Design a binder for this molecule. Sequence first.
Ligand code: ANP
Lengths: 372, 156
Amino acid sequence: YQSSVKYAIERNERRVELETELTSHNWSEERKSRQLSSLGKKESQFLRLRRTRLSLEDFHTVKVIGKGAFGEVRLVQKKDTGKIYAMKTLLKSEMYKKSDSPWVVSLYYSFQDAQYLYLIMEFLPGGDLMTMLIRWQLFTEDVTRFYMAECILAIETIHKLGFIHRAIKPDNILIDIRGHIKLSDFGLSTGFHKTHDSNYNRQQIQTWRKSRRLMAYSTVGTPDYIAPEIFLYQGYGQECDWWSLGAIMYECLIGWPPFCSETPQETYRKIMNFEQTLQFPDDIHISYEAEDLIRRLLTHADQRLGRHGGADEIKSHPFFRGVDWNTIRQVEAPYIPKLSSITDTRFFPTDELENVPDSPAMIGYTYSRFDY
Amino acid sequence: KTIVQLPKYVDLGEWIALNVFEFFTNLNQFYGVVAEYVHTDYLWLDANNRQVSLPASQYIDLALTWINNKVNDKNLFPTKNGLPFPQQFSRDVQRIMVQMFRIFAHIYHHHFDKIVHLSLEAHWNSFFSHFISFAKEFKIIDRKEMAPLLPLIESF
Ligand SMILES: Nc1ncnc2c1ncn2[C@@H]1O[C@H](COP(=O)(O)OP(=O)(O)NP(=O)(O)O)[C@@H](O)[C@H]1O
C-alpha cells in the first residue's frame, strides 16, 4: 500500500495497450478494388484470436534431452493438441543479468512458473555436433567442409542482424531431420571465465587428451572457442565468432579442440598463448589449404593493417573449392539422422544426472500479430 | 466510446469474454491498492441458507473468487481451440458483470475516501467510467441495480 500507485503506472500501459490494439483492428479496410470479383457472400471472418491463459502440465514430457546450469532442455508433447516441442527450462532468481531465418532454432513464445522461465522451440531430432563428434570422430575432410559453410552462413546471418554469438560450440550447434545444421541461440544463457587461477603413465597424447569427456558436464562452460579477447576485457565484435569456428574446425579434423587443457584453467593459459601453444598432431591428414584456414581463423582478431573485416572472404578461401554457396541447403547430408519416430531421442544421451542447487522446494499472451 | 464497441466482424462472445476478463483483473489491482486496512445495500448468494447480512465491506474475498472460479473454467470460458461457448454465459456474464458491480460500488461508497490522497483517482474514475459504458452499451446490466451509481453516473 506504499507502492500501490504501481496500479496507476501499470494501468496506463493497460489503457495504452488497449488503445493501439484497437486502432490495429482497423488494419482492415485493406480493401482490394483490384477485384471486380464477388459479392458472393463474404470473405471476412475474424475469430479473432486470444490471450487466453496457459500453464505447464499442458505439456506432457517425453524424455529429457540435455542439461545446463540455468536449467534443462526437453522434448515435450503438448497435452492439449499433441505436437512435439523443444522445451527449455531456465531460472529466475537466482540467476542474474537484472527472427525469420532458416539457420537458427525457432523460439515461438514463452511462459513461466514461480522460479523457472520456460522456452518452447522447434525440436531438433538429430542431437548436436557435440554428440556427433563423439559418435564417430568425423573422418571428415569433406564432411567438415559441409558442416562449416553451413556454420558460416548461420554465423554470417546472425552478425548481419547486428548480433555476436560469443557462444559457438559442438554442443551449441544442432542437427535437423535432413541432417542439416541450425545453431539456436545463447537464450540468453550467461556467466564468465574470470579472472585468473593461482596455485603454483600416459602412453599416448591422443589417449591422454582422452581424459576429456569428464563427468558429463552439468557444471561447465568450457573454452571450446573463447577467442582470447573476451578474457581479457570489454571488446570483440563480429570477429568473436570466427575464432570459435577455427576452434571448432580444428576439433572435428584433429580429435580435440586446439587448447584442450585437462583443466578448465590451463585454458586460458594455452589459449592466451596460442602462437607457441597451437600444434597440429603427428596423425597426418590435413590439407595445405585446410591448415591455412585455421591459422588465419585462429590468429589475432587484429584490425589495423589487415581487415577481417571478414565474414565473407572466408568464402574466398581455397579451402572451399565450390559449392555455389547457393545450392548448399539442399544437398545430401554427411549423416541423415535415421529415426524411429517423431519422438526419437535416439540421438541424445538421455543419461541421468538430476542436480539443481536451486529449489526450496515446496500466464500470458499480450502479444500482437498471428502465426502461422 | 469506440473501444468497448464490438469491432467489425468479431464474434461478440470472444469480444465479451475478453472484455469481462480484462475488467476483473483491473478492479482487483485497484482493490489491490486498498488491500487490507478494512445508503442501505443488498446482499445475495441465496437460497442455500445463504444471502443474509452484515458484510460491512471486507467480504469481497470470497465474492471475487467465484468469478475467479467461473471465468477460469474450461467449459464456461472456452479458451481452448475453436470449441464454442454455451452462450448461456450471456446470463452468467451478466452475473459476473453485476457481481463485479458490487465491489465497484462498495469501493465507491465507503472506501473512496483513501483513494484521493494518492492522486490516483482519475485512474479509477476512468476505469469505472470504463466499466459502465461497456456493460450499459451491451445492456449487460439493468437500470434498477445501478441506483447507487445513478447520482454519480449522469454527470457526463
Ligand atoms: N531447440 C532444441 N532442440 C533440440 N535439442 C536442443 C534444443 N536446444 C537445446 N537442445 C539440447 O540441449 C543441449 C543444451 O541446452 P542449452 O540450452 O544449450 O543449455 P545451456 O546451459 O542453456 N547452454 P549450454 O551451455 O550449451 O548447455 C543442447 O546441446 C542440445 O543437446
